[PDB]
Design a protein around this ligand. Structure first.
Ligand SMILES: Cc1c(C2CCCC2)nc(N(C)C(C)C)c(-c2nnn[nH]2)c1-c1ccccc1
Length: 130
């Protein structure tokens, strides 16, 4: 399983615009923009865990594929999230207040590539094994 590992952010495109679309205020966008998180992905049986570690904020989710769960996001949104596997890509949708965002996690070569979309905005974040 190409996703298991500890992954360090190495590049990011359009993350500020994405955060704006999420409703994140300026001071918090400022901190989030300069963060270089680690993403730690593990699996045991049916249960996938994704841990994000950074100096300004840590988060953790554990989920079963196809099973909706409640999540509090890093920016404090209370969302309903569902994550499925579609041709080897982990696809997560977060829904709240009639809005939604999609986060796709893909393995490409040596990279974990994460594409985040909300409205017209597409952010791409690349991570490499720690
Ligand atoms: C929404 C979000 C936030 C919010 C809090 C600050 C304002 C935005 N911070 C993150 N960082 C930078 C770490 C420090 C928690 C990440 C993030 N999580 N992993 N890497 N980056 C994400 C995120 C990125 C892409 C896909 C899903 C979630």
């Amino acid at each position: 399983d190409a996703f298991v590992g500890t992954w360090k952010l190495v590049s990011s495109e359009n993350f500020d615009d994405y955060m704006k679309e999420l409703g994140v205020g300026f001071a918090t966008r400022k901190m989030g923009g300069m963060a270089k998180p680690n993403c730690i992905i593990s699996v045991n049986g049916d249960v996938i865990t994704i841990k994000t570690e950074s100096t300004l904020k840590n988060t953790e989710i554990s989920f079963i594929l196809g099973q909706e769960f409640d999540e509090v996001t890093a920016d404090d949104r209370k969302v309903k999230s569902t994550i499925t596997l579609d041709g080897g890509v982990l696809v997560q949708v977060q829904k709240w207040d009639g809005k939604s965002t999609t986060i796709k996690r893909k393995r490409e070569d040596d990279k974990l590539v994460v594409e985040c979309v909300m409205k017209g905005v597409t952010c791409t974040r690349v991570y490499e094994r720690a």
